[PDB]
């Protein structure tokens, strides 16, 4: 697909058996995505973004469906007030930009 | 250009006659850069991201070479830890997401 960029790039995911929307984020070295439940074992880890750090959690290999094409990664949660699909999962997907 | 997403998306632009590294940010609502001077008459603004907000400052039709592409719109400045090129921008150098 490709995405154009006049509107936000909001796509959806399907994680834990959960149906979401999340945001195709260039900016973002990782993926991080609004309190929910993830399989067990997890890290603490801190993220910083413009104006401020915030805690999360790090779970790893987790199975998340973009749009329709499956991948697993480190996938972060915490304090974010949207769904962000970073990098990491981003070259999962062989996602690029063009111009 | 096809960028891919295995680094940050970095990229060489001009402003103001100088040359500076900003980030091509799906995730950016709007263009934000470091502190820097531009052409005068400017409107206050705040803008939101992870773990808080910080107030910058609003250029209108400003001239922006990125990696080669003029675009002529908002610029927002002030203490963002990176220089961030938004979607405002992106639409007007034609780029897109493609996965
Ligand atoms: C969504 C976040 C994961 C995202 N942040 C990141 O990718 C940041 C650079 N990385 C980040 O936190 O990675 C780990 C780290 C931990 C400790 C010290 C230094 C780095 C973010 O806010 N990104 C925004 C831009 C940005 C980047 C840096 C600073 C301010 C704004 C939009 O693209
Ligand atoms: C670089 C910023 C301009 C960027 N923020 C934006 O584009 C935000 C949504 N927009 C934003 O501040 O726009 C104006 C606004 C003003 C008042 C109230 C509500 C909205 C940002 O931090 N973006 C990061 C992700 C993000 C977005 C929202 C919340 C937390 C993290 C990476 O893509």
Known sequence: PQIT???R???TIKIGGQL???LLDTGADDTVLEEMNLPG???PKMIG???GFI?????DQ???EICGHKAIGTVL???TPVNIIGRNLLTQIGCTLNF
């Not at 805690?55 to 779970?59: A, L, T």
Request: net charge positive.
């Open 77 to 79: 949660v915490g304090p």
């Open 62 to 64: 987790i199975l998340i």
């Open 5 to 7: 960029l006049w509107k």
């Open 9 to 11: 790039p909001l796509v």
């Open 20 to 22: 979401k929307e999340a």
């Open 55 to 59: 805690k999360v959690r790090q779970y």
């Open 49 to 51: 973004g413009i104006g």
């Open 41 to 43: 074992r997890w890290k």
